[PDB]
């Protein structure tokens, strides 16, 4: 299948409560495999998936050096952004960054990403060309000018087309029994009367991986987008995800409704109905 690697950085200031926290987590698809937290008793890069544990000390040391360096750099960046927005020293602020690479089903680079946000709003992003920037405002234009001056984009491109893909492929091989295994959803439809003449049909998908899934209800073969209550896909805590979609239907009309499930783990898409 297609696969991706992402690192997610959160740098958060907290005036009066010490220096800004820096936390980095790394993912392959929906599987976290590393963390680094500057607030840890002894901050170091820690494994969070069994298949990464085989990496040698050089790997962990390299990672930790990078994250420790970032802990410092991102603090300066937070100071800089505070100034770019003429903000007071009183408030907490957050830089977030997500970056990494996407592979297609042939294992080839589909595209790279490097995106940053400030206080939850898009700040600056590397364009798909891996060569130019999109800055959200005149503050981010200052960063852009700095990054253009320092040829940051060229270094991200080198990483994204090189190390990023190389390591992702390595992880996919090392963790192939899980990372390259799609677990299809276990499905059932439940029925709950909400009144004498309406009932809830809830279509459940449990135990699936990866998280991407499509769960819809149709009535007489027509999508019921507006009338469907769809919960956010949620982690079970055992690597798998859960989701449900519910419709309230007129009593007696239950068989006009079909739940449709699309998941990578499904060679054939499911059509389910309530089975009384």
């Amino acid at each position: 299948g297609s696969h991706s690697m992402r690192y997610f950085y959160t740098a958060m200031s907290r005036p009066g409560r010490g220096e800004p926290r820096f936390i980095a987590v790394g993912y392959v698809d929906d599987t976290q495999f590393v963390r680094f937290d500057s607030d840890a008793a002894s901050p170091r890069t820690e494994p969070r998936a069994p298949w990464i544990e085989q990496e040698g000390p050089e790997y962990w040391d390299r990672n930790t050096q990078i994250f420790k360096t970032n802990t410092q750099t991102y603090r300066e960046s937070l100071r800089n952004l505070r100034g770019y927005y003429n903000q007071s020293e009183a408030g907490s602020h957050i830089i977030q960054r997500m970056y990494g690479c996407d592979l297609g089903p042939d294992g080839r680079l589909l595209r790279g990403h490097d995106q940053s946000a400030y206080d939850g709003k898009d700040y600056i992003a590397l364009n798909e060309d891996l060569s130019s920037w999109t800055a959200a405002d005149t503050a981010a234009q200052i960063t852009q000018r700095k990054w253009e001056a320092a040829r940051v984009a060229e270094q991200l491109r080198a990483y994204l087309e090189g190390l990023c893909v190389e390591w992702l492929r390595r992880y996919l091989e090392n963790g192939k029994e899980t990372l390259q295994r799609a677990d299809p959803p276990k499905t059932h439809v439940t029925h709950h009367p909400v009144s004498d003449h309406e009932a809830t049909l809830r279509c459940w998908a449990l135990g699936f991986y990866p998280a991407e899934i499509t769960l819809t209800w149709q009535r007489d073969g027509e999508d019921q987008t507006q009338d469907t209550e769809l919960v956010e896909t949620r982690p079970a805590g055992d690597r798998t995800f859960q989701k449900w979609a519910a419709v309230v239907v007129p009593s007696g009309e239950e068989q006009r409704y079909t739940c449709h499930v699309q998941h990578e783990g499904l060679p054939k898409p499911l059509t389910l109905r309530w089975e009384p």
């Binding site: 750099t73 990483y159 190390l163």
Partner: peptide, 11 residues
């Protein structure tokens, strides 16, 4: 594996 930044990677 993450990307190595420099000091000029500051925002």
């Amino acid at each position: 594996h993450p990307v190595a930044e420099a000091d000029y990677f500051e925002y």
